[PDB]
Design an enzyme around this catalytic site. Structure first.
Site, PDB file in Angstrom:
ATOM      1  N   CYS A 173      44.127  40.249  41.815  1.00 50.48           N
ATOM      2  CA  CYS A 173      44.523  40.355  40.524  1.00 50.48           C
ATOM      3  C   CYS A 173      44.705  41.714  40.030  1.00 50.48           C
ATOM      4  CB  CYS A 173      43.746  39.573  39.364  1.00 50.48           C
ATOM      5  SG  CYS A 173      44.100  37.806  39.333  1.00 50.48           S
ATOM      6  N   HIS A 185      48.129  34.365  32.909  1.00 48.32           N
ATOM      7  CA  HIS A 185      47.572  35.292  34.000  1.00 48.32           C
ATOM      8  C   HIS A 185      48.718  35.224  35.277  1.00 48.32           C
ATOM      9  CE1 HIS A 185      45.416  37.980  36.640  1.00 48.32           C
ATOM     10  NE2 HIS A 185      44.216  37.473  36.407  1.00 48.32           N
ATOM     11  N   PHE A 224      41.405  43.719  37.297  1.00 50.60           N
ATOM     12  CA  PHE A 224      40.257  43.372  38.176  1.00 50.60           C
ATOM     13  C   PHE A 224      40.926  42.182  39.133  1.00 50.60           C
ATOM     14  CE2 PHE A 224      38.141  44.989  34.253  1.00 50.60           C
ATOM     15  CZ  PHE A 224      38.265  46.148  34.397  1.00 50.60           C
ATOM     16  N   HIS A 241      41.759  43.441  30.699  1.00 49.84           N
ATOM     17  CA  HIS A 241      42.098  42.455  31.795  1.00 49.84           C
ATOM     18  C   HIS A 241      41.859  41.128  31.072  1.00 49.84           C
ATOM     19  CE1 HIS A 241      42.818  40.802  35.847  1.00 49.84           C
ATOM     20  NE2 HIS A 241      41.666  40.203  35.806  1.00 49.84           N
ATOM     21  N   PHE A 255      39.391  39.576  42.538  1.00 48.16           N
ATOM     22  CA  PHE A 255      38.383  39.065  43.562  1.00 48.16           C
ATOM     23  C   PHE A 255      38.169  39.882  44.744  1.00 48.16           C
ATOM     24  CE2 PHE A 255      39.565  34.125  42.704  1.00 48.16           C
ATOM     25  CZ  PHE A 255      38.901  34.225  41.283  1.00 48.16           C
ATOM     26  N   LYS A 268      47.019  38.536  27.554  1.00 49.03           N
ATOM     27  CA  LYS A 268      46.926  37.299  28.321  1.00 49.03           C
ATOM     28  C   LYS A 268      46.996  36.215  27.448  1.00 49.03           C
ATOM     29  CE  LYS A 268      45.489  38.662  32.806  1.00 49.03           C
ATOM     30  NZ  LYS A 268      45.167  40.097  32.793  1.00 49.03           N
TER      31      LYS A 268
HETATM   32  C1  LIG Z   1      42.616  36.780  39.619  1.00 54.68           C
HETATM   33  C2  LIG Z   1      41.264  37.751  38.665  1.00 54.68           C
HETATM   34  N1  LIG Z   1      40.128  37.851  39.003  1.00 54.68           N
HETATM   35  O1  LIG Z   1      41.856  38.031  37.518  1.00 54.68           O
HETATM   36  C3  LIG Z   1      41.735  37.191  41.032  1.00 54.68           C
HETATM   37  O2  LIG Z   1      41.773  38.702  41.392  1.00 54.68           O
HETATM   38  C4  LIG Z   1      42.628  36.257  41.976  1.00 54.68           C
HETATM   39  O3  LIG Z   1      42.137  35.447  42.465  1.00 54.68           O
HETATM   40  C5  LIG Z   1      43.761  36.912  42.630  1.00 54.68           C
HETATM   41  C6  LIG Z   1      44.366  36.210  43.789  1.00 54.68           C
HETATM   42  C7  LIG Z   1      45.701  35.431  43.717  1.00 54.68           C
HETATM   43  C8  LIG Z   1      46.436  35.187  44.898  1.00 54.68           C
HETATM   44  C9  LIG Z   1      46.609  33.723  45.249  1.00 54.68           C
HETATM   45  C10 LIG Z   1      46.009  33.123  46.694  1.00 54.68           C
HETATM   46  C11 LIG Z   1      45.690  31.730  46.544  1.00 54.68           C
HETATM   47  C12 LIG Z   1      46.184  30.963  47.820  1.00 54.68           C
END
Ligand SMILES: *[C@H](C(N)=O)[C@H](O)C(=O)CC/C=C/C/C=C/C
Ligand SMILES: *[C@H](C(N)=O)[C@H](O)C(=O)CC/C=C/C/C=C/C
EC number: 2.3.1.41
Lengths: 403, 403
Positions: A162, A332, A389, A297, A391, A327
């Protein structure tokens, strides 16, 4: 050495171009709708931050055959940015000093799934076809833009969940600073599909208690928020070296005076706060003007929202800036969130106003004290900050200032 | 300002560590095998570049449960690179000047398909589980490494199809040059699965006429080559600032004296020799020593192989370097190709020998006045070059030199 923004493009849940986005922003207008697709899929979250535009025929049939939605959204966004920046084909094409750095958070789960599903049918390879790799590969957003737009400089994608399109813009700035590029189109895109959203629902990251009232589902800082509202779309900005911009008479939105990129090195999926403090501080090194507005965020999640507010409290102390989580309006867009929110920030800087943080029926107790603006307020802004931010504890923040 | 490599890790089709990889490279050993999975999926290509390693209990349970194969391969490679670098937790963890830039070309098609399949099952969300996002997101390789290793510096993935890990290393170098980081772990990983492999077969990119003789399928430059042999695995190198390295008595394989990153801006899925010419030239700028050995991208495809050659002939003209396509031995690990091949090059530099370009029964008439080494050749090397190209016309080349 100095990098400025001279053009922007955007396809989002609250607008198909910057004029539509502008209006949506000032009116605190929601881009969230009910999604029948998400309900039919068996998810608990049925709310969408969808792009209201039929992209059919919007791109050359021969060109679009290699693209997925994330690429299509970024492509249309880069088309707007090119025109907005007043760039002629002879100015950015077949030019080694013009690059492209754009990405997505998930590439194309829909086509990854389409390919697998097709392979297992009675037609096999012939049902799969020869276009799934470019559509499903993680670098699709950059590959599908750099080729048709005739880019000769840098060409690759930055992906950081994200925070991807935010890191994309920051990297573009570094290319200008290293004197490697005069212009770099930066941003990203993300498709919207149950294939991917179901995976967020499965980990309880999405909102599920406001399906009857979609526009109220995304409620950053509200005491009863219950997860973010997934969305899709694209964003693109023209990062240009200052002298190059001034020399051609380019219209500059702002200069990128700060770029932070740090790592938590702690928890996957959940923010630590500690890394965000360093990220924001890093973006502030050298910036001696105050941060007039901070586009958080703030995804509308229980832990995330206050974790970032805690980080902000730490970085600014008793002099925090006006804050608002757009948001709550837009949803998002994951990988596209960074560039789109940078654009909302640029629009606020350009038109002198602060977009509202909507849907706060009961401000969270931990948000006490802070200056989160809940009404569209006119104000002359000079320096703005934007946080992203993702994961894996990946943080990014951009500081833009008016010239 | 100066960047050197002080450690390396690798999990590949020809070895589970650098000592094993050296042995196969010198021996000219093939890592390609017959794949029942591929055959069983409906594919025409049944040959694999598989990692012969049971990773089962190699990574902590609570950590590995967020990871996919690409991440697992990169993680094990990082472990080896840390030890081989002589680094300890107290020196690399919770340190803002230590970063991580690693990625994959496709993330995790397998777990993305698993999520979609699980969802469609009677249990839906509960069948999906809460770990598919980190496993399937494009930034998985960097996210899954930066968190457990407690990285505090940069943390994101560069993705550029079959050039991703090469661009990853180049970006790491720029972090050192910009004085932002002292150390950056760079590289990547890629999983091996029919889910993804079937998509390349569907576009006719994979070899299909040598399934009966797997070790002969990958034949770069051979008149009868018929597509590349897909592979999986990981690679990781420690990019360190020169002074920092010398000060700690670090072992230095070489310095990265050149890094090119260009764009074709012409074709999707097909290389335009000109972009590669600029890329290589860009990497050689300032290098006052000749290129002694060139590890080509040479994937064993009809068009690709000779296009890079034409590019090479155009760059070096008369005096060309010794060339060899190690893919004829290892297969094409896609996103992991760049870092693994940089490692093969480092091993050749470090051990004074040129790995053979195997399986050439009949040399293509396009590879004329060149020097394609087809026998392990003991030689004192000083400067080596490595090329990586990907769909979307993305190019990268790295030039490494002894200090
Ligand atoms: C979103 C957030 N924490 O704000 C987080 O970073 C996230 O999950 C981004 C990844 C999205 C990609 C999808 C992959 C799934 C198959
Ligand atoms: C490989 C090459 N040209 O050598 C090419 O760049 C490529 O297809 C890399 C992308 C692999 C990622 C897989 C995505 C499929 C879902």
């Amino acid at each position: 050495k100095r990098a400025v923004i001279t053009g922007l493009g955007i396809v989002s849940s609250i607008g198909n171009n910057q004029q539509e986005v502008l209006a949506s922003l000032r009116e605190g207008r929601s881009g969230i709708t009910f999604s029948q697709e998400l309900k039919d899929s068996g998810m608990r979250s049925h709310v969408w931050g969808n792009v209201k535009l039929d992209t059919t025929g919007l791109i050359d049939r021969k060109v679009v055959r290699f693209m997925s939605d994330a690429s299509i959204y970024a492509f249309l966004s880069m088309e707007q940015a090119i025109a907005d920046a007043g760039l002629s084909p002879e100015a950015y094409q077949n030019n080694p000093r013009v690059g492209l750095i754009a990405g997505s958070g998930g590439g194309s789960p829909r086509f990854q799934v389409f390919g697998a599903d097709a392979m297992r049918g009675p037609r096999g390879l012939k049902a799969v076809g020869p276009y799934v790799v470019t559509k499903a590969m993680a670098s699709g957003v950059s590959a599908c833009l750099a080729t048709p737009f005739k880019i000769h400089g840098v060409n690759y994608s930055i992906s950081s969940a994200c925070a991807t399109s935010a890191h994309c813009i920051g990297n573009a700035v570094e290319q200008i600073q290293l004197g490697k590029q005069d212009i770099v189109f930066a941003g990203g895109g993300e498709e919207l599909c149950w294939e991917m959203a179901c995976e967020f629902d499965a980990m309880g990251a999405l909102s599920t208690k406001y399906n009857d009232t979609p526009e109220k589902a995304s409620r950053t800082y509200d005491a009863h928020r219950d997860g973010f509202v997934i969305a899709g779309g694209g964003g693109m900005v023209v990062v240009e070296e200052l002298e190059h911009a001034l020399a051609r008479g380019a219209h500059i939105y702002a200069e990128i005076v700060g770029y932070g990129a740090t790592s938590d090195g702690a928890d996957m999926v959940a923010p630590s706060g500690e890394g965000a403090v360093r990220c924001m501080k890093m973006a502030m090194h050298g910036v001696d003007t105050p941060i007039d507005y901070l586009n958080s965020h703030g995804t509308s999640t229980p832990v995330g929202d206050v974790k970032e507010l805690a980080a902000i409290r730490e970085v600014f102390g008793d002099k925090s800036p006006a804050i608002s989580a757009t948001k709550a309006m837009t949803g998002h867009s994951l990988g596209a969130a960074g560039v789109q929110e940078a654009i909302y920030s640029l629009l606020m800087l350009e038109h002198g106003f602060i977009a509202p943080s909507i849907n706060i029926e009961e401000l969270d107790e931990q948000a006490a004290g802070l200056n989160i603006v809940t009404e569209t307020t006119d104000r002359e802004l000079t320096t703005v900050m934007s946080n992203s931010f993702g994961f894996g504890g990946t943080n990014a923040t951009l500081v833009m200032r008016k010239l």
